């Protein structure tokens, strides 16, 4: 898991290696720039000091002339550094951008060259996160951090070299102090660089119950765990709060320690330097230049660690992409060493074919199948689901290879001939097709390259899918939505048949081509299928026997092996399995957030005080620095000079200690108030969303994951929106206001001159800060807005592995990649220019300020201590203003966040779950009466699913509801359970209308089983224990319900039997077992009204009886309503209701519906026996 460095710089041109070399040279130059500026600064301040000393003796002419000369060194260094910085940044960014574009295109090629078996095992999203995260990490690992790394190493080396060639004594002292300085700068950059992932994990620990309660929305009011899930969520928030508090405390400890160390080093270095300057051994400019070069060098070598971090990350993230690109499959679509026939005649040969799925290789579905199919032979295969008809279809197109035997098509085997040429000539429709979300002309064009619209019209008229083309607008320009959601299912399957038929194939393979289709359209589709079957070989897999009776050969699967063979009458005169089949068939808010942290006002007041002191900490440094220099700018007694120097060293130390305390306090207090606000806001938004109705979440914009992300991000952004603006404003005021004032008092002219520069210096500071770690994410946003095509061509590997059109989607990916690449190059150039210009203006401020200062000193208008004060108080004031106002989070998105949070908190549901008001009778009977009830979905207001049904249910009346899939089966459940209230109709619950009753009482009395069993992230004892709430749950009822649901055996078998931790949605254990535990979880409710919705969807035949015996012994006393597709619970039901498009067609006893032969008898004579 550590790529060798040479392997990553693969895909590098010669132009890119030239870019890298020249960028490294420019980076070294721009790095070594700064210690030379310190050199010139030392020489210049020495000039000023000697002029002052002499003019205080003779009690200023050559001063102006020598400053004239030094301005030229300043300007030269400024220009050279501007050029070197521009070159370094632009060249490194261009090299990395082009290299990463090449990497990404070649990686997509590799991820396309694979096979479905290698793609069906790995997760689909895994490759998505691999692409985005891995590629962006490779980009940042080689983009610029190498530039800044070499620049910081150059600054360190040149700084120590200058410090040694000037004076080696103070240099050895600052060297002895240097390792702790480097460590402090490294840790301080390390904690300011990321500031996201640790708090993200601290919240992710709690994101589990978030995803729990937002992944189980419907069943959560039946479970009624709102109070309990809210308690557990409060616990998780408490732990997250404690971890975040410890984070803030330790981070601010490290910050304060770094600043205390900086200031103690200032104190020691000035103490020793002034000892030498007073002992005549050193000058003041010399001590200044030696100290500034060594201190800056140590800080830079400290700041060059995140480059190493990002490079290690880039190697680690490139390992997997290189392994993907490195892998070559046995069969390559791109490879042209495959063999291609010419006289392609339809002949199928399978002999001794054994194959198992590599996802589950322990189970063997197939145990040998031998077939020989001639041309024009319509072969159908019949059998139950589990034998693998779809397995045989996937075995045909060489999606895999059989482990035993050899398959052949017309003499020669598949294993020596080309895969793509074979893949284009077999037109296959799968069971559930997928449609790409383009126009329908492109969709029907997707078979082959050069198809004109006349062949399109002939193919769609063969498919009989031109009428719905005729009725909708944009008859070749209609953009079908995601996964065929815009159109209906029958139009979708008919145009899918068209999309296969445009290839003009040699072998046609249909797999369940008429699942959701009606009578006449399946008829005309099958007539068209016999219109094009005479030149081709065909295999049809279907459930309806209307299209099977007119075939050539019928065959039957049993346990994977094809057992029966022959024509219709041969299987009819043999009375086999199939015999039994045919015999049976015949914004809005503006700063109302100030009151959100109001209760923690001591934190706010101590924070504003500490911010005032931490802002004013700068002009005090200006004062002490200028005073300690002016002590050596004038003449005085040696002892007075030594006393002043010692006093100012002590003042440096004391200022450092104050800085430590105040940084700790401000950081801790603001972080603590922020975290308390985030906790109080997450708690409240979760409670207010739990108080909502099901109609609220069912809104199309109110999605689960989107809402957990809204919580995670906005509840942490609104804390900044309130605390950070105030803290930063106060910091910047106490930093720059008193600075401009003290400057105006002493030097009036130079203060105006530098006022004409402070904005650009602040801008340079903010830019340098945004460059230290993290500038912009917009490139990811462009790639994402253009990245859905790779997602869709990855997920739907199925259609692309057969259509033989992979290169077209690779070219589409290239067309998607083109324009962001041009924009990235233009942005690299612009960014280089801006960075260089800002740093150069920071380099030219020296020259301007000190030339005007020399002209002022020469004319007696001010001293040198004064110009030093104005400089160090105004220019560094503006630089600190920029540096600090950078770390502040921006304000517009924070405001939008607070607005939406307050909106959602403020929103109140029409029905309140916490209120007790309503009709509370002490008694009931258990009779339900629906009358003229109509319901339309709020997300689909134009489409009515109901047209006024009615129903009468009495005590103990086993009421079966039978109908088509999607005719309002669970809608009556949702009308009962107070999810949706209908616009019209009347529902009487024992002569008591549900709209006037208590809301929680109806949700307490009844108890259902969901359409899909969902459990929570705990053990099975807490799975069944969720069924009864606000009540002391007895374990005797737990074991009694586990015995009654016949899940007691599977619980008592498991180790840690009632403490066995179940994962998400019961993904560890099987579907029948979680269905039985859903039966046990509903069973503890003991409901007076019981509903079942698909009680035997995935369950064994011996388990259905042991589920139903508890139901039949407990159906007395309670009203029972079962909805299922299996007829075994429908035969013994009391009254049976058949639905048709929401309308009640037949009702009454089962013998009455069996007497009058209608649509129910149609479904009652399918598998009667």
């Amino acid at each position, epitope marked *: 898991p550590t790529v060798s460095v040479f392997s990553m710089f693969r895909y590098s041109n010669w132009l890119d290696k030239l870019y890298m070399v020249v960028g490294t040279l420019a980076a070294i130059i721009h790095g070594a720039g700064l210690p030379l500026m310190m050199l010139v600064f030392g020489e210049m301040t020495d000039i000023f000091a000697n002029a002052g000393n002499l003019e205080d003796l003779m009690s200023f002419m050559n001063l102006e002339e020598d400053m004239t000369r030094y301005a030229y060194y300043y300007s030269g260094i400024g220009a050279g550094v501007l050029v070197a910085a521009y070159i370094q940044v632009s060249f490194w960014c261009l090299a990395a951008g082009r290299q990463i574009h090449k990497i990404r295109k070649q990686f997509f090629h590799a991820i396309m060259r694979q096979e479905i078996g290698w793609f069906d095992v790995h997760d689909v999203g895994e490759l998505n996160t691999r692409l985005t995260d891995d590629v962006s990490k490779i980009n940042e690992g080689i983009g610029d951090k190498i530039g800044m790394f070499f620049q910081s190493m150059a600054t360190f080396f040149t700084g120590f070299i200058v410090g040694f060639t000037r004076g080696w004594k103070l240099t050895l002292v600052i060297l002895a102090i240097s390792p702790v300085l480097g460590l402090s700068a490294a840790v301080w950059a390390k904690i300011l660089s990321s500031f996201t992932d640790k708090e993200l994990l601290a919240y992710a620990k709690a994101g589990a119950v978030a995803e729990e309660v937002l992944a189980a929305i419907r069943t959560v009011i039946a479970f009624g765990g709102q109070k309990k899930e809210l308690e557990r969520y409060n616990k998780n928030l408490e732990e997250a709060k404690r971890i975040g508090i410890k984070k803030a405390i330790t981070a601010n400890i490290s910050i304060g320690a770094a600043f205390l160390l900086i200031y103690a080093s200032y104190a020691l270095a000035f103490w020793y330097g002034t000892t030498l*300057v007073l002992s005549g051994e050193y*000058s003041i400019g010399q001590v200044l230049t030696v100290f500034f070069s060594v201190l800056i060098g140590a800080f830079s070598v400290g700041q060059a660690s995140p480059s190493i971090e990002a490079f290690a990350n880039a190697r680690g993230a490139a390992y997997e992409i290189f392994k993907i690109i490195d892998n070559k499959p046995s069969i390559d679509s791109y490879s042209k060493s495959g063999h291609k026939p010419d006289n392609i005649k339809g002949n199928l040969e399978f002999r001794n074919v054994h194959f198992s799925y590599p996802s589950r290789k322990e189970v063997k579905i197939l145990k040998g199948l031998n077939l020989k199919v001639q041309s024009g032979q319509t072969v159908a295969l019949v059998g139950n689901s589990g034998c693998g008809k779809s397995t045989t279809v996937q075995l045909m197109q060489r999606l895999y290879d059989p482990t035993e035997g050899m398959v052949s098509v017309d003499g020669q085997d598949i294993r020596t001939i080309n895969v793509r040429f074979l893949r284009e000539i077999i037109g296959v429709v799968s069971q559930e097709p997928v449609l790409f979300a383009t126009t329908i002309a492109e969709n029907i064009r997707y078979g082959r390259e050069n198809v004109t619209m006349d062949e399109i019209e002939k193919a769609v008229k063969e498919a009989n899918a031109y009428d719905f083309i005729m009725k909708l607008p944009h008859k070749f320009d209609t953009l079908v939505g995601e996964r065929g959601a815009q159109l209906s299912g029958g139009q979708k399957q008919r145009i899918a048949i068209a999309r296969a038929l445009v290839r003009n194939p040699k072998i046609l393979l249909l797999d369940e081509a008429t699942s959701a289709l009606d009578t006449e359209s399946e008829a005309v589709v099958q007539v068209a299928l016999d219109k094009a079957r005479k030149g081709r070989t065909t295999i049809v897999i279907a459930h309806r026997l209307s299209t099977v009776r007119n075939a050539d050969v019928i065959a039957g699967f049993d346990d994977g092996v094809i057992v029966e063979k022959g024509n219709h009458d041969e299987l009819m005169k043999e009375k086999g399995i199939y015999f039994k089949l045919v015999t049976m068939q015949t914004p809005v808010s503006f700063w109302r957030i100030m009151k959100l942290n109001l209760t923690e006002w001591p934190y706010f007041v101590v924070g504003v005080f500490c911010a005032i002191i931490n802002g004013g900490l700068q002009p005090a440094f200006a004062i002490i620095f200028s005073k300690i220099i002016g002590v050596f700018t004038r003449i005085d007694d040696p002892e007075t*000079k030594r006393q002043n120097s010692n006093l100012f060293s002590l003042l440096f130390l004391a200022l450092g200690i104050i800085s430590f305390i105040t940084f700790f306090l401000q950081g801790f207090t603001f972080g603590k108030a922020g975290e308390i606000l985030t906790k109080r806001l997450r708690y409240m938004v979760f409670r207010s969303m739990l108080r909502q109705d099901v109609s609220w979440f069912d809104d199309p914009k109110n999605t689960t994951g989107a809402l957990t992300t809204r919580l995670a991000n906005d509840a942490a952004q609104v804390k900044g929106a309130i605390g950070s603006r105030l803290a930063v404003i106060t910091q910047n005021i106490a930093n720059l206001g008193t600075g401009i004032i003290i400057s105006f008092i002493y030097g009036w002219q130079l203060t105006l001159l530098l006022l004409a520069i402070v904005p650009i210096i602040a801008i340079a500071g903010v830019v340098e800060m945004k460059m230290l770690s993290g500038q912009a994410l917009k490139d990811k946003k462009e790639l994402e807005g253009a990245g859905k095509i790779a997602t869709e061509a990855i997920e739907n590997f199925r259609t692309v592995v057969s259509l033989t059109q992979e290169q077209k989607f690779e070219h589409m990916y290239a067309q998607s990649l083109q324009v962001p690449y041009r924009n990235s190059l233009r942005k690299a150039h612009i960014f280089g220019i801006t960075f260089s210009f800002t740093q150069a203006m920071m380099y030219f401020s020296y020259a301007g300020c000190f030339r005007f200062g020399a002209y002022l000193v020469a004319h007696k208008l001010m001293s040198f201590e004064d110009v030093l004060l104005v400089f160090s108080a105004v220019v560094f004031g503006a630089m600190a203003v920029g540096q600090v106002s950078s770390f502040a989070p921006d304000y517009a998105k924070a405001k939008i966040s607070a607005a939406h949070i307050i909106m959602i908190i403020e929103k109140t549901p029409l029905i309140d779950s916490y209120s007790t008001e309503g009709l509370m009778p002490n008694t009931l009977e258990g009779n339900v009466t629906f009358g003229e009830v109509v319901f339309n979905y709020p997300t689909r207001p134009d489409i009515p699913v109901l047209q006024g049904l009615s129903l009468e249910v009495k005590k103990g009346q086993t009421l079966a509801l039978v109908g088509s899939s999607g005719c309002g089966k669970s809608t009556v459940v949702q009308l009962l359970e107070r999810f949706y209230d209908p616009l019209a109709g009347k529902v009487l619950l024992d002569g008591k209308e549900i709209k006037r009753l208590n809301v929680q009482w109806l949700r307490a009395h009844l108890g259902i089983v969901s359409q899909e069993p969902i459990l929570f992230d705990c053990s099975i004892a807490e799975n069944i224990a969720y069924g009864d709430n606000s009540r002391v749950v007895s374990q005797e009822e737990i074991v009694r319900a586990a015995k009654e649901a016949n899940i007691h055996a599977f619980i008592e078998s498991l180790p840690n039997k009632y403490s066995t931790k179940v994962g998400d949605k019961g993904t560890q254990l099987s579907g029948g077992q979680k269905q039985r535990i859903a039966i046990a979880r509903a069973l503890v409710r003991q409901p007076h009204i019981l509903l079942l919705d698909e009680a035997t969807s995935a369950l064994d035949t011996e388990s259905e009886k042991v589920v139903q015996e508890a139901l039949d012994k407990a159906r007395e006393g309670r009203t029972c309503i079962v909805i299922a597709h299996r007829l075994s619970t429908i035969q013994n039901a009391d009254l049976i209701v058949v639905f048709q498009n929401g309308r009640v067609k037949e009702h009454g006893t089962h013998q009455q519906l069996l007497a009058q032969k209608g649509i129910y008898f149609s479904m009652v004579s399918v598998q009667a026996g």
Partner: antibody, heavy 122, light 114 residues
Framework: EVQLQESGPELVKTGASVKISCKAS????????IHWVKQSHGKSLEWIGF????????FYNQKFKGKATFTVDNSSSTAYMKFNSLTFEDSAVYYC???????????????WGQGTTVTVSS | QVVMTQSPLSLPVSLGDQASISCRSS???????????LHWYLQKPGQSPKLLIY???NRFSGVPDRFSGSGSGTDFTLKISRVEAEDLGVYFC??????????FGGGTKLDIKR
């Protein structure tokens, strides 16, 4: 441990020019001023002037201005004093002395040159 | 333009007893800051003058402590304790508080008093 030493005697004739040399070792030349001081025979010492060893700026006593020129050589760490048309009154012993630049007359002349006696003769 | 006057132009001293040399300034040798600058140097025949006692009463690093100096206003004095035979030369004083032109004294030689 600072050691300045001078050239040595120079028996020159009237109306001529002579250069006197003070060589300083063992310390930082860039800081101190070098002070030139005259001493006739059997009389009190007399101050001639000072040369800034840093950039070469000078100051002359009123009597001696226009009769003496001070120069400095940094790479050689030496100071030079030259007369112009020296008379009979300039036969004396001359001294160079050290004085730091930070203190500036609040400190003594710590270290002295050994002294080189000039003599005018025809 | 202060004018120092070193009282004895020669001091007949023996070896084993002590002497005292005194300088009188024509002006007050205090300073506006509050310190007095009057340094005493020693010169030997054919050598360079050394610094014996700088400032008011302070002693230069690298000299013994036999030498001492006390004074006030416009009258100062040096004192040699346990006089030896090596520390027999010319002395002089030097004013530095009013320095347009530096001022020195006339000096004093010592004797052996035979």
């Amino acid at each position: 441990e600072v050691q300045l030493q001078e050239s040595g005697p120079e028996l020159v004739k009237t109306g001529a020019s002579v250069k006197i040399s003070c060589k300083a070792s063992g310390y930082s030349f860039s800081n101190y001023y070098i002070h030139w001081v005259k001493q006739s025979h059997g009389k009190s010492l007399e101050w001639i002037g000072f040369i800034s060893c840093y950039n070469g700026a000078t100051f002359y006593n009123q009597k001696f201005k226009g009769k003496a020129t001070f120069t400095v050589d940094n790479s050689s760490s030496t100071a030079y004093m030259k007369f112009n048309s020296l008379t009979f009154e300039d036969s004396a012993v001359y001294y160079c002395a050290r004085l730091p630049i930070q203190f500036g007359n609040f400190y003594p002349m710590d270290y002295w040159g050994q002294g080189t006696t000039v003599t005018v003769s025809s | 333009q202060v004018v120092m006057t070193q009282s004895p132009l020669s001091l007949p001293v023996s070896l084993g007893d002590q002497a005292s040399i005194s300088c009188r300034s024509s002006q007050s040798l205090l300073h506006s800051n509050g310190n007095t600058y009057l340094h005493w140097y020693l010169q030997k025949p054919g050598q360079s003058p050394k610094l014996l006692i700088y400032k008011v009463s302070n002693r230069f690093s690298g000299v013994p402590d036999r030498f001492s100096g006390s004074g006030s206003g416009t009258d100062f004095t040096l004192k040699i304790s346990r006089v030896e035979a090596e520390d027999l030369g010319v002395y002089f004083c030097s004013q530095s508080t009013h320095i347009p032109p530096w001022t020195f004294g006339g000096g004093t030689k010592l004797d052996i008093k035979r």
